Amino acid sequence: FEGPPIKTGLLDLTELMKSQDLLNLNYDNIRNSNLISFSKLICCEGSDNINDGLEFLSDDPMNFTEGEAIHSTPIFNIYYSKRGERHMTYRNAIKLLI
């Protein structure tokens, strides 16, 4: 996408499109993500709270994964995705990161 900026309070969603560490659909890979990867998005020009600026994000529950052991003689784990709890949104992952 080659598109002019899209400022929304304190985020550039164009930079969210161009991001590579924050477009995962797992809740854990965004919750455990880095501040360097989030510092790409910030473009404020005068807000006063992160909670007021993060309103322009998703409130739907993400599809995270839960790995269980298999109980076999070559023992291993089998991971898979799964809808999380009402709290496992995208805004909550960004707030925990912050």
């Binding site: 969603l13 994000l57 998703s58 409130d59 298999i70 109980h71 291993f76 089998i78 991971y79 995208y90």
Partner: protein, 1885 residues
């Protein structure tokens, strides 16, 4: 396929219990595949996907004013229609595999539309588009419809349908009713292959033995089963069913006893441990001491490397004459009196030129100028030695042995006792001695001390300077490691040894018996005297400080001379083919070191180089005895269950003559112990499932295992590499015929002498050796024959038509080959002639027997060896064979041929024990061809048999098995342990978790002991006699053949018995004289042993039956335990891979492992097999089928063997063809998961070896960089000896055209206008008219003039449309012409007929005119014996075939291509004839004359448009590869966590010709289609011949050679006809199996190109590669493509990404404003997104984007109505408590009645056809239905029914009254299925 609908079909399959409803599932699956292809094709055409529109709707859409009162169009419905340019196109989609349905529906539509065609005054084109689902190929019928659509972009996958078809079939496999349902037609047989049987069979003594071996009722069953005629009887299976129901009692009791053995087993299986390995080692060392002569003295060692080395002296000149003077003055100056020192001083005096260097160089340069002036050799001028000071110089570095300067005693002592001219157990060194191993360890430490130091040289060479950029940007660490190799003394040592051995071979070619020669290298200290195959040499090293020499046990003595020391090695005598491997050793060294080192920082490079300097330079058996048993020792020590003690105690025989053998033996011994200790350090990677495919599988990459050959930690893939790679270090053909022929004869005769005495009975019951359980065999064959021939009904048709039984024998490529075959006759005169000529040659050679074998031997069976095609020519000329159908002739030779003879010879393989190979006579080939193809096409049906799988796809079959077993294990452990793991959610939960169901995965990697020798051949009689697709007379003849085949004789070879009658001592227990009765006959009757590989498919089928019995035993044994099991068993000829997955609860896993291995041994023994327990190992993770691994679902292969064959042999034709074959060595490595940097190392080594062969290394005399406008060899084309510069994905895909292709892509990237740069290749080739040529670089002008005048033609034009492709172009330019004689060829019959035809009076022109008037048999085979005989006669006019018939070795070809490098060998007139309108010419003046001529030619824009039109725009593969390289976008780097196997899709998606190419050329040689229509194929071929003007160019060439010659030439005309029909043959060409190992699975074509570019860029990670625009074209192989693709794909990706980004990441309350702000204001992939939205709105698939078309205001009712037809669902109403309304798409029912009785029912449809009524009744009565219709009514016409199904199940669907009665009759067949009526209820209006 819309995953929800996928899941509804899948849950519709899992719930199936009836055999009557799976037919409905199959029909729904086929129509779902059909309309999926319809939607995708109407998408790629941008036409509206209509369904079920009749003709009347088409008429009122085209002509909307007529009423149907005028006309009645027929009520047949197309798939779709299209009206454009006042033409109606009736379109019909097919997903068939053959055109048989297409032609009949074409006839139907065309016939029923010719009436309406000329009434409405519009033409009606009938278009049929058929796609093949296994290999996506479009076949559009209308050649006018393709003019509308020049480019068609379907890229879809039909494997989500193949999966459901195969799992539904294997669910309902053993049922017979459903197999009758999925029958194509009926069980039909053809005409008989023979009209009468063989009554001599019943009186045959082998049949008498076979019959009296069996008890009486089995005798009667066999007697009546041979005579069963399946065509006469009512059902074909009424014999198989009879014998199955006979033997079912004994079968079931055996399976139940073997299943009850699960409780008798204790958990003590054959584990490895250090105790058993130590005891096996003790028994081994005792056995080896009793076999060998164990030595303790260190000076009995053999040379580990046949070379000593010293470093270079910079203080001396590296001039050749100065080094010659230094060598002579340093040999003369030896201080001391050793044994041979006077001979060394005398040889130093014989080469003393004093100081007359100028006279020496003048004389030698004059001789070399005389030699290089001719193409031939200089004849009839003798060479005189010139007296130079103190040297009789004969040539450069060739000195006479002067009898005045050496004493006769010293000369005799030197040539007798040092050179070995004229001069009882094998003596090996004690590998278990402490002092011997300690001396070995000090040898290795001393070599590491000298060779690890730096050189003091630059590391610049050919490999580094020319490929280091590629190697470096693939991986910086590979570049650093290769640099560190090139800095040390290892690389200088092995480079000096390669250069010195190349000089030794170049020097010893023209050495004489009285001359010695001197060979030099780039090191000014290391020399070599070549003494007078068997090259004898001695290395001489001048070194300053004593003890500063590399000595791998080869030194004779270090001596004191002036100005330092001098060391001379012992005299080494080697073969030419061993010195050949020595020359190529830097490639082996560098490959081995970089492959061992790769991606492992725990290893030290000096350790790897120290090991690999000895493994890369070992050309003796002493390491062959260690590298192949190392696999079995280390893997059996690593495994769960093995008999490594038995392998060491019985089979490991180390043969340690060298000290490196002793060192490596201690490495193997330590690694066995260490391999046992570390098997608990193998972990599994966490598996990501998706319910669709497995990503991230395999084995974890932790370095915890101890390395084997050198200290360090290592991971499991690298550990298996260290185990399995050293076997490919071994050379091939290190065996001597004199010893391996006696070894093969001994092992055959020992097995036969064992079986003549000890093996008496044939059948058993208690698993005795070489005996078969009869009842189990018979019942298992009955079951598997029933299953296999009940799958497919036309199986005899498939056998006859896939193997050409009805055709002539001259059309089968195994009967017309050039391999050896045996023949028996009175061949006395020819053998006496060749014997007296070879003795005459011997005595003439020594001036400057067969008859003693014949007279001593009375019962000598006389023979001679012949090629196969010559034997066929002889049998056709002597009228033994005819051009009748071949299978009748085979059935006649099955009676007419009684005595079978077989001789043998050695394989000459790299195994320590060589393998026997049997050559049989031609009639045996015919009969075993018949038997084996009958067995083959049934092994094609069985999924467990793996020879029938075509090559290397077995690596993908392994992955499919492993993935289904992981999925089974996951689902089974989640199902069985469901309630326990729910009750989990602390002392109370652990003991709860101890009682749950635990899993077990077991993998048996089995081999079989003596698969062909110790095999009961009598079970194959029961395989033949039970076969229902044969006639009784055919069975009778085949069994009579096998009865005669068991009475076969084994002729011992004549050279073997030459070397046994010249033996002069009676051998102790001569088994050869025992079996041959003291050598009075050369033949031995072999009975049981059926040679080798003669019966691969038959034995594989019976082995698959054995594994079926084993599978059934394990199923019953586990269902005794109330647990689940999945057994897979892949069966090759004898390699077996059984994988057992068990989830049970009752007993421990050790008891199950012990039971399973006991029962595997027993199940192999019940069928006459025997599991090789010494080589059979059991693991958890590692599968190992035929050299193919599967680690935990991730496929794995040793790519090191394909890397190590990059210095292999070749044809040695020219500098291009050698490079071509060596690059093919690296492409196969890339297929087997090689990293990119090691692939570039292999490509570099390939170029290095090729330039070494022709003296083209940088600086040498054939180096082309000083002759062309180029700054490096990357800027010289490959044809003119440049190096290959292309991306690695491009090299792997197209291959060797990637040089030209990548050069043209670079020119496009450099010179196109800026606005056309991020576009397709077709849109950029159209901008060549805007190029200016005055600013092209001189390199670019040169390389285009190469492509314009030496690759293409001068008469070509930029406005042509159908020029040739790269495939129709020979690529060589500079090939050396060798002056050779043909050969002997006296032994051939057809060659004698050829020589009788040359001396015939004007007879050869009849042959030429018969070839020319019937020209198609210059490129293909002939249909009858006349065509074949004239082709066989004509093939002797080609020289290259005649030199192919005479045997040659690649070493002599190599030496000749070295030495003939400065000769004039390039016929430059053949190159000059290429363009505009002397003798031979060297390489350098060919370069000069070529660059002289190309400066005179001109190059304009029209010529570049010719170049781009003929290299790129022809071929669709070149278009899509250029588009992948231009338009690629790289993505996110990630590791290769789960690799997978994927086949290469074909890039030429569209086909024009639908007959076979031989048939098309045979029909083009006439003007008559001879078969279905062929009106299109001949006119496509005629358009191709006329539009590129092949015929006129051929006429111009024959006319100009007529004008040059004057007399009417025919041989040139046949060369022109041959080239013409070659070009036509590659034009028609109507595939391959190229499976790769890629980081994900590639389903489409563009996904395969994405994974090929994403894999081959870095070693460490892989990238996600998406493309800018459509990277495909519209087929039409030799046809231009001037039309690009509409960018609808970009619009699809854009709005799919936008909608899913917007509802995944953006807040929900503001998503429409986000969408508007995207659409109005952004751009996706350089295209404005408003334009992509306009593309979607103007398209015909707006129904895909319904949520996008809403929230923006562009959506209307036609879209929703269109959409509704697609995804149709079911709607119920009315659960009040009496009328139901079940509505669907154009399908609604209304049902009126009480609880008891229903009054009437009204269906409502769109069309009233009896198919659609039952379909609608099935779908509308499958949802929520109040009740179960529980009453009946008498019934007369459609009704609603129900059948009962066990435990409260019913099926609800509408039948006809007639169909109610018919299905009640069919389920009232007398059977086992308990009968359920379809008791019918209420009437359906």
């Amino acid at each position: 396929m819309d995953y929800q609908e996928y899941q509804q079909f899948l849950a519709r399959i899992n719930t199936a219990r009836d055999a009557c409803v799976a037919k409905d599932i199959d029909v729904d699956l086929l129509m779902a595949r059909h309309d999926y292809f319809g939607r995708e094709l109407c998408k790629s055409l941008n036409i509206e996907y209509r369904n079920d529109v009749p003709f009347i709707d088409i008429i009122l859409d085209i002509r909307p004013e007529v009423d149907p009162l005028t006309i009645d169009a027929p009520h047949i419905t197309p798939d779709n229609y299209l009206y454009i340019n006042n033409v109606l196109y009736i379109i019909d989609y097919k997903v068939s595999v053959s055109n048989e349905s297409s032609v009949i529906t074409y006839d139907k539509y065309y016939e029923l539309t010719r009436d309406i065609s000329d009434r409405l005054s519009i033409p009606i084109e009938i278009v049929i588009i058929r796609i093949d689902p296994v290999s996506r190929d479009l076949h559009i019928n209308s050649d006018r419809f393709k003019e509308l659509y020049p480019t068609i972009v379907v890229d879809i996958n039909f494997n989500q349908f193949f999966d459901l078809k195969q799992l539904l079939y294997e669910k309902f496999g053993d049922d017979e009713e459903f197999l009758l349902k999925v029958a194509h037609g009926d069980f039909t047989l053809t005409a008989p292959w023979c009209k009468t049987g063989c009554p001599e069979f019943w009186k045959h003594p082998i049949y008498k033995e076979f019959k009296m071996s069996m008890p009486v009722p089995e005798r009667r069953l066999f007697e009546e089963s041979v005579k069963f005629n399946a065509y006469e009887s009512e059902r074909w299976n009424t014999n198989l069913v009879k014998i199955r129901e006979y033997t079912k009692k004994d079968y079931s009791e055996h399976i139940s006893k073997s299943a009850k053995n699960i409780f008798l087993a204790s958990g003590f299986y054959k584990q490895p441990n250090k105790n058993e390995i130590s005891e096996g080692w003790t028994l081994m060392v005792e056995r080896v001491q009793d076999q060998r002569e164990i030595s303790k003295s260190l000076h009995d060692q053999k040379p580990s490397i046949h070379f000593i080395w010293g470093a270079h002296n910079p203080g001396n000149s590296n001039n050749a004459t100065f080094k010659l003077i230094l060598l002579s003055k340093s040999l003369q100056s030896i201080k001391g009196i050793s044994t041979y020192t006077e001979a060394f001083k005398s040889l130093g005096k014989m080469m003393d030129i004093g100081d007359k260097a100028i006279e020496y160089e003048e004389f030698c340069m004059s001789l070399k100028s005389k030699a290089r002036s001719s193409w031939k050799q200089i004849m009839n001028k003798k060479l005189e030695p010139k007296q130079i000071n103190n040297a009789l110089v004969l040539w450069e570095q060739q000195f006479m042995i002067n009898n005045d300067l050496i004493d006769k005693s010293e000369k005799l002592k030197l040539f007798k006792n040092f050179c070995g001219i004229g001069k009882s157990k094998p003596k090996i060194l004690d590998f278990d001695d402490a002092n011997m191993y300690l001396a070995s360890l000090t040898m290795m430490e001393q070599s590491k001390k000298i060779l690890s130091k730096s050189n003091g040289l630059k590391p610049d060479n050919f490999i580094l300077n020319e490929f280091g950029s590629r190697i470096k940007d693939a991986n910086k660490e590979t570049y650093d490691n290769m640099h560190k190799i090139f800095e040390t003394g290892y690389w200088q040592c092995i480079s000096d040894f390669s250069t010195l051995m190349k000089n030794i071979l170049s020097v010893s070619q023209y050495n004489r018996h009285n001359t010695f020669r001197i060979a030099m290298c780039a090191n000014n200290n290391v020399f070599a005297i070549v003494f007078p195959a068997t090259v004898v040499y001695s290395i001489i090293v001048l070194h300053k400080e004593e003890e500063n020499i590399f000595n791998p046990g080869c030194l004779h003595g270090t001596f004191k001379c002036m100005n330092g020391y001098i060391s001379i090695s012992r005299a080494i005598r080697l073969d030419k083919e061993r010195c050949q491997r020595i020359v190529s050793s830097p490639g082996l060294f560098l490959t081995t070191c970089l492959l061992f080192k790769h991606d492992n920082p725990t290893l030290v490079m000096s350790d790897i180089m120290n090991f690999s300097i000895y493994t890369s330079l070992s050309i003796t058996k002493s390491v062959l005895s260690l590298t192949e048993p190392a696999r079995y020792m280390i893997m059996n020590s690593l495994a769960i269950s093995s008999n490594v003690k038995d392998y060491i105690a019985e089979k490991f025989s180390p043969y340690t003559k060298t000290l490196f053998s002793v060192y490596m033996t201690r490495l193997i011994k330590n690694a066995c112990f260490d391999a046992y200790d570390q098997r608990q350090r193998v972990q599994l990677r966490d598996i990501y499932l998706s319910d669709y495919d497995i990503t991230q599988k395999g084995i974890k990459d932790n370095r915890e295992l101890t390395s084997i050959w050198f200290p360090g930690s290592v991971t499991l893939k690298e550990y298996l590499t260290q185990i399995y790679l050293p076997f490919y270090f071994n050379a091939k053909g290190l065996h001597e015929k004199h010893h391996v022929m006696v070894d093969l004869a001994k092992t055959i005769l020992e097995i036969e002498c064992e079986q003549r005495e000890n093996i008496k009975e044939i059948w058993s019951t208690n698993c005795t050796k070489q005996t078969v359980n009869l009842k189990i065999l018979i019942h298992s064959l009955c079951k598997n024959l029933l299953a296999d021939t009940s799958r497919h009904n036309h199986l005899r048709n498939r056998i006859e038509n896939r193997n050409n039984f009805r055709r002539s024998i001259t059309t089968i490529s195994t009967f017309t080959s050039s391999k050896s075959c045996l023949k028996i006759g009175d061949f006395r005169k020819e053998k006496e002639l060749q014997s007296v000529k070879q003795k005459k040659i011997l005595e003439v050679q020594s001036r400057k027997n067969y008859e003693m074998l014949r007279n001593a031997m009375p019962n000598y069976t006389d023979y001679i060896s012949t090629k196969v095609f010559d034997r066929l020519y002889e049998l056709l000329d002597k009228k033994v064979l005819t051009d009748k159908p071949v299978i009748e002739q085979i059935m006649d030779m099955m009676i007419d041929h009684k005595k079978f003879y077989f001789t043998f010879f050695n394989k000459g393989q790299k195994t320590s024990k060589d393998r026997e190979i049997f050559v049989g006579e031609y009639e045996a080939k015919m009969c075993m061809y018949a038997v084996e193809r009958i067995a083959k096409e049934r092994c094609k049906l069985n999924p467990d048999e793996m020879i029938s799988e075509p090559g290397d796809g077995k690596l993908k079959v392994l992955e499919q098995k492993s993935e289904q077993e992981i999925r089974f294990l996951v689902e089974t452990t989640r199902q069985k342990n469901r309630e326990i793991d729910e009750a989990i959610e602390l002392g109370k939960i652990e003991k709860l978790s101890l009682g749950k169901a635990k899993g077990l995965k077991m993998e048996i990697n089995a081999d079989m002991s003596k698969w062909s020798a110790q095999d009961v051949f009598y079970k194959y009689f029961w395989l033949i006699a039970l076969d229902p697709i044969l006639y009784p007379q055919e069975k009778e003849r085949i069994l009579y053949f096998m009865c005669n085949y068991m009475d076969k004789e084994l002729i011992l070879p004549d050279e073997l018995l030459f070397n046994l009658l010249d033996q002069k001592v009676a051998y102790q227990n001569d088994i050869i004289a025992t079996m041959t009765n003291q050598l009075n006959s050369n033949t031995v009757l072999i009975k049981r042993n059926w040679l080798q590989g003669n019966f691969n498919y038959t034995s594989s089928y019976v082995h698959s039956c054995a594994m079926s019995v084993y599978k059934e035993i394990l199923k019953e044994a586990i269902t005794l335990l109330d647990g689940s099991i999945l057994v897979n068993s892949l069966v090759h000829s004898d390699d077996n891979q059984t994988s057992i997955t068990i989830v049970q609860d009752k007993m421990e896993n050790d008891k199950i492992i012990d039971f399973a291995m006991k029962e595997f041994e027993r199940a192999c023994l019940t069928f006459g097999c025997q599991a090789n327990m010494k080589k059979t190992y059991v693991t958890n993770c590692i599968k190992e089928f035929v050299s193919l691994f599967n680690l935990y679902g991730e496929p794995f292969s040793i790519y090191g063997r394909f890397l190590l064959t990059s210095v292999g042999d070749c044809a040695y034709i020219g500098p291009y063809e050698d490079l071509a074959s060596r690059i093919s060595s690296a492409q196969t490595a890339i297929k087997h998961g090689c990293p990119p940097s090691l692939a570039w190392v292999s490509i570099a080594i390939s170029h290095w070896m090729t330039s070494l062969t022709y003296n083209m290394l940088p600086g040498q005399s054939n180096d082309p960089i000083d002759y062309f406008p180029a700054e490096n060899r990357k800027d010289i084309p490959i044809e003119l000896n440049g190096v290959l510069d292309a991306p690695l994905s491009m090299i792997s895909t197209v291959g060797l055209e990637s040089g030209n292709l990548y050069f043209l892509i670079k020119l496009l990237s450099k010179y196109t206008p800026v606005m056309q740069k991020r576009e397709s290749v077709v849109n950029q080739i159209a901008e060549v008219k805007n190029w200016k040529v005055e600013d092209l670089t001189d390199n670019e002008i040169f390389r285009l003039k190469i492509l314009r005048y030496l690759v293409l033609d001068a008469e070509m034009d930029p406005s042509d449309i159908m020029g040739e492709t790269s495939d129709m172009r020979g690529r060589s330019i500079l090939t050396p012409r060798k002056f050779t004689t043909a050969g002997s060829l006296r032994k051939l019959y057809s060659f004698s007929k050829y020589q009788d035809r040359l001396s015939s009076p004007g007879g050869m022109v009849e042959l030429f005119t018969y070839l020319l008037e019937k020209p198609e048999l210059l490129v293909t085979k002939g249909e009858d014996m006349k065509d074949y005989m004239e082709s066989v006669i004509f093939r002797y006019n080609s020289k290259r075939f005649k030199e192919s018939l005479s045997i040659q070795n690649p070493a002599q070809l190599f030496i000749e291509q070295i030495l003939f490098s400065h000769k004039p060998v390039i016929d430059f007139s053949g190159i000059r004839d290429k363009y505009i309108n002397l003798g031979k010419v060297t390489f350098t003046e060919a370069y000069r004359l070529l660059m002289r001529d190309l400066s005179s030619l001109e190059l304009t824009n029209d010529d570049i448009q010719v170049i781009y039109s003929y290299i790129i725009l022809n071929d669709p593969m070149m278009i899509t590869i250029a588009n992948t390289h231009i338009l690629s976008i790289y993505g996110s780097p990630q590791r290769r966590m789960g690799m997978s196997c994927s086949t290469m899709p074909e890039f030429r998606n569209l086909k024009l010709i639908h007959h076979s190419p031989a048939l098309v050329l045979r029909a083009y040689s006439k003007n008559n289609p001879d078969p279905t229509e062929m009106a299109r194929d001949l006119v496509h071929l005629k358009e191709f011949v006329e539009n590129t003007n092949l015929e006129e160019k051929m006429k111009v060439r024959i006319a100009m050679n007529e004008a040059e010659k004057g007399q009417r030439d025919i041989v040139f005309e046949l060369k022109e006809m041959t080239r013409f029909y070659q070009v036509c043959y590659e034009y028609v060409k109507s595939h391959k199996i190229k499976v790769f190992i890629l980081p994900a699975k590639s389903y489409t074509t563009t996904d395969f190109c994405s994974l090929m570019q994403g894999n081959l860029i870095k070693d460490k990670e892989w990238y996600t590669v998406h493309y800018l625009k459509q990277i495909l074209s519209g087929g039409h192989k030799a046809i231009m493509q001037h039309n690009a693709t509409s960018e609808q794909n970009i619009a699809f990706e854009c709005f799919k990404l936008i909608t899913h980004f917007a509802d995944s990441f953006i807040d929900s309350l503001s998503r429409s404003a986000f969408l508007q702000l995207i659409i109005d204001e952004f751009s996706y992939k350089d295209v404005k997104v408003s334009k992509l939205y306009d593309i979607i709105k103007n398209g015909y698939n707006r129904t895909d984007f319904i949520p996008l078309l809403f929230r923006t205001g562009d959506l209307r009712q036609a879209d929703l109505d269109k959409y509704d037809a697609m995804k149709s669902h079911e709607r119920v109403t009315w659960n009040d408590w009496i009328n139901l309304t079940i509505t669907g798409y154009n399908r609604s029912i209304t049902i009126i009645g009480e609880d008891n009785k229903l009054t009437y029912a009204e269906l409502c449809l769109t069309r009233k056809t009896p198919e659609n009524i039952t379909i609608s009744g099935r779908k509308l009565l499958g949802s929520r239905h109040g009740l179960k219709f529980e009453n009946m009514s008498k019934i007369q016409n459609y009704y609603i029914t129900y059948r009962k199904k066990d435990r409260h199940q019913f099926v609800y669907q509408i039948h006809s009254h007639e169909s109610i009665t018919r299905r009640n009759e069919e389920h009232m067949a007398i059977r086992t299925r308990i009968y359920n009526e379809i008791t019918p209820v209420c009437v359906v209006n």
